[PDB]
UniProtKB/TrEMBL annotation, chains E, G:
Taxon lineage: Viruses, Riboviria, Orthornavirae, Pisuviricota, Duplopiviricetes
Residues of the full protein shown: 66 to 124 of 590
Entry superkingdom: Viruses
Originating species: Rabbit picobirnavirus
Name under which the protein is recorded: Capsid protein
Length: 525, 525, 58, 116, 59, 58, 59
């Protein structure tokens, strides 16, 4: 009780008055006094350390759009493709024109097209959110969290809005059944920005597609297929919007160039009414959305799994395309390669990592199956291909399973200050810091040593709900002479899931995203 | 929305109902698969690391009872003394038989006596709390968080329970006025155990006195005074109540040993009355108290200041007594010393550390003057003596100001498990990790190097609301070539307070605690 | 006599307020305007202040 | 405290000021963009002065307070003060700059500080 | 009839609202691109002529 | 407020400090840093526009 | 008018909050930074003066 430290209320209202005028992006000039013997310390000069780091801005979740590891006809896509082509032939008659996969493929292409368009919606809808208290916001966030040239967007807010609504109308002419619960997902995921707390001065997370998908018509060998090219994103130039459109252009030029294409849409319309197709609402220069505080989404994160488990290493990713088997089964399963940050070709003396049996943390005492399902699929599993490996080789791996979005890497930003510096543009640098999910005791934020695995700058704790950090300890450091692992993260009601269990659930969850039981249940004689 | 990922009301409840079969205390069997070349790594058995540490139990806040740094005829505490004294002598016809402090001294003696009795009550009360989901609770918590021999208490509870009730009745016949706001604090602090979440599985903090205060009219020429003897506590031998009562007996039989003090007791009943005095309540046959979820207390924690800023060093603490010179001024100002882990006498090439201008974090967006005052005083300021030092010197320091508690050192604990039981009582070890408030980039949890400053065993993040960790970075590591400091901890709405601004608040806060005057414009019994 | 030097608030950063304010204003103007980028944020802000200071004399 | 100036000079400078703002084709093209987005009355307007108008000294307490508390740059007239770099510039089309700097010397050696 | 060239009540107000940001007196920055052979023309700097005269005031 | 400095000599405490001048009533002290922080804000407030971005006019 | 230096009331209530916790008789630790040439000044040692006089009690 505060009443304890003051006589009358009125008197208290006067002795604790402290200003919280230290805006978001400004530096936290906190000080630590020091005392040592100058002749025994390498080069440290003063004996007073004034801070110059602002509270962390937030974190960028670079994800790979996913349909859920697909290897058998049982998996998500293949199944949906099935009931879909059905519902369509249902209303049609006569000669066959296109195979089932070739159709379903087209649909996805359209979905992934909207993915891009949506991130663009996000881009504009948020171009006007300003909240005095947080200087990061307006701009900075776009630059780092979304990877979008704010100045360019702000300066052309008019034309960009228009070019958008144009898209919305033009894409509306590309059939797409509004029943696919998967849409609702990606839509929500890349349409907002989430807060780690009900406070604006708090840090915030954002999801960002690391790429897109164009349709690649039946060449001569590979039957029709869906190609994936990378967003040139991670630590490069913070892309202007004209690049996001010029890509969408390319994206539909693909979906459209297929001889069968059009006649497909028609057949689709004949199946579901205009009321059965998705379409986004147009927006005005004034539309402004707000950061949101979704507990569930945070939880999804805290639990998730980072593919690039430790930024100290060099990661790769191939075979991300979506093909169709000789027997009409839709296939997708990304494979990658883990190598050392020095000899980009070998692994040498470094150690590859991926977690199997992982933790699951509930922020509710009595959790329930319902909450489990939701708080999961954001976490995935990686399996190594080879039994064991050599210093001269590469570490090969397949992705056994995962959720709707595959978390590739995660970066948290904060700008460091330095008033009085030559170039004005550089008195405030917005530096990033890699977030590694798996690490080791006695690790340093310098790749250089520690078997190739770096630790995380303790900054990260600023992110309430940050994903679980798993630290490995040699039998040496452990009090039980046996080596195990230490857990990091705000635990409340934790529990463990098997690599096997996770596989199960995702292999299932995704199936749901692309299926509707209601669909083939009301068709009469 | 989970409805999305559920293809059937059933199929969901079917593979989502995962178990939360991990009772807090059992090991978190999380696993990390990893691949390397056995030829280039200094001995590492398998390529699969099974977890083995349990969620952290909680943390022990070893604090030194404080009256507010006071060294002046005006530094509050003395003011308060004159204040009280006046009210007693007020309508009393006898003759000056003891000066202001002489009295005040006596009272505090009684207060501190209770601070023990209370921790004792707490011990007996909590021996009845058991929860099927926290195997730490009953036992382990006592031994580590409160430092009380459980096995000993269990064997002789009834006797201790009855003994407590007897002491209570004795204490309730000692002249301590029920109006001292300070009491209510100390009582609440050493009566409960606080959770860091509304969940029982979560971790929990506890406050524990680092010692006690004896009354003695022989120890210093200037007059009656209170001496502080260290609780032999710093992770030595987890003490039994047997010892805890024996010390209280010493304490009270000591207050009773001064003819003067008794003559005072009298003067008090004369001016306060039967019920103008404090009274601690006995304990029923059923009584059992519960861990509390007080947010304000957590806040105090997060914000507090740890004296022993980094367990990688060796700390001292003397002159903790409270004296009085020239019959009108009270004195107390603890002083300590800082040396390296090797030469308990020199400081050598290690670096002394204390924080000045610090951070203040609110978990509420709109902090009110009220919330400030409360979340404050738990944080204190330490100032070095000489401006510079030699490896052959010691690094001396005083305490500028602090709250009513003053956190000395902090340790958190977890269980580490062992399948291969070479014994039986050796297969579940309870180990501790030191928590350092100030550290440096690239520090290790090994006392070994890092200029004598340890980093924190990363699992500390399990304590949502842990104290702010201030990490310093050499201008080298910094992206701004200027050295500063990094902040760690769940920040939401932060701000900064000045060394001086902080002193000023406690100077006030503490004064408020022992403030009486408000019983001088109106008289009772 | 209080001889004062008109101030805009010590500013030397891409964030020191005054610049923020500039971007702010600029956005609202360019907002529903179909023309093409003919001047950056400051270029504008600069003009405005000029007008302001003119008044300080008038 | 040089020569107590006449209005003659004060207008001539305003004329310079506005004819200067008008001299930038770019600036005008801006004026336009503004009316486009603010409107007839979205703009500031200073009022003319009537035949009778006469204003009075005011007793604003808040202003006095500001005074009492303020900070004088030239903290002590016993010295000699300077002040340069008062302009407001902009580098790399997105940041505004202004930070006045000065110098402090003795009343004798306008160049050194000597024993002051 | 403009209704014709407007696909949306919005998209129109979106890219048609051009500014009439040229106050009579300011210069009409109209431009004429042009290509020639520098060898056969008596000195002509660039190949882009930016306008520079304002609308006529009066007579 | 006139701030007058006294040499440890003139001081009754052999430690040098400063004397305060001006009709004080209810005083208090602000930090160099605490002051900067306020104007950094105050000034920003002056030229703050955004509050005309969640709603449009004419 | 204070309304001038803040957007919403609520936001202001947060940026000016200053404590007046400097009790009567305590010292007014106000500081004056200094800069001179040590070799030309009799005996003054530091270049920073922290106050230590409380507000006058009375007369």
């Amino acid at each position: 009780d505060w009443s304890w430290y003051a006589p009358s209320e009125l008197v208290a209202k006067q002795i604790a008055n402290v200003p919280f005028n230290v805006l978001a992006g400004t530096p936290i000039k906190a000080s630590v006094h020091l005392r040592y013997d100058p002749s025994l310390v390498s080069g440290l000069k003063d004996q007073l350390f004034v801070g110059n780091n602002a509270s962390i801005m937030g974190a960028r979740l670079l994800y790979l759009p996913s349909f859920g590891i697909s290897t058998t006809v049982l998996d998500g896509l293949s199944m949906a493709a099935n009931q879909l082509y059905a519902y369509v032939r249902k209303s049609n008659s006569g000669a066959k024109v296109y195979e089932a996969p070739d159709l379903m493929m087209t649909v996805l292409a359209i979905q992934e097209a909207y993915r891009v368009l949506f991130e663009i919606r996000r881009a504009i809808t948020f171009a006007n959110y300003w909240n005095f208290w947080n200087k990061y916001l307006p701009k900075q966030v776009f630059e780092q969290l979304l990877a979008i040239d704010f100045d360019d967007l702000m300066s052309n807010k008019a034309n960009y809005c228009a070019q958008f609504n144009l898209m919305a109308q033009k894409i509306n002419t590309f059939a797409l059944p509004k029943y696919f619960k998967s849409i609702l997902r990606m839509a929500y995921v890349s349409s907002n920005i989430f807060m780690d707390s009900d406070a604006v001065t708090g840090q915030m997370y954002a999801f960002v597609s690391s790429g897109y998908y164009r349709y690649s018509a039946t060449t001569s060998e590979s039957g029709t297929s869906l190609v994936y090219r990378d967003w040139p994103v991670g630590a490069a130039m913070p892309r202007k919007l004209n690049r996001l459109f010029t890509v969408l252009r390319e994206l539909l030029d693909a979906i459209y160039g297929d001889a069968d294409a059009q006649t497909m849409f028609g057949d689709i319309y004949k199946a579901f009414g205009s009321d059965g197709l998705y379409s986004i609402a147009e927006i005005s220069v004034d539309e402004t959305s707000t950061p949101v505080f979704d507990v569930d989404i945070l939880a999804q994160i805290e639990n998730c799994t980072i593919l690039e488990a430790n930024a100290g290493l060099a990661w790769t990713l191939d075979s991300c395309n979506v093909t169709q088997s000789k027997g009409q089964v839709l296939l997708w399963q990304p494979t990658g390669t883990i190598t050392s940050s020095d000899n980009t070709e070998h692994i040498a003396g470094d150690i590859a990592v991926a977690l199997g049996d992982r933790v699951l943390n509930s922020h509710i005492m009595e959790p329930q199956y319902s909450d489990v399902l939701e708080w999961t699929r954001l976490m995935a599993t990686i399996e190594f291909d080879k039994a064991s490996v050599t210093s001269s080789e590469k570490v090969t791996f397949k992705v056994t399973s995962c959720g709707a979005e595959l978390i590739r890497n995660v970066l948290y930003f904060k700008n460091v200050w330095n008033d009085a510096a030559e170039d004005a543009s550089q008195r405030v640098i917005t530096y990033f810091s890699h977030f590694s999910q798996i690490t080791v005791t006695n690790a340093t934020d310098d790749p250089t040593s520690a078997y190739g695995l770096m630790s995380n700058t303790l900054d990260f704790t600023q992110l309430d709900w940050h994903p679980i950090i798993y630290v490995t300890e040699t039998s040496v450091h452990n009090v039980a002479n046996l080596n195990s692992i230490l857990i990091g993260g705000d635990l409340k009601r934790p529990t463990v899931i098997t690599t096997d269990v996770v596989k199960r659930i995702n292999s299932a969850a995704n199936y749901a995203l692309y299926y509707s039981a209601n669909l083939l249940s009301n068709i009469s004689t």
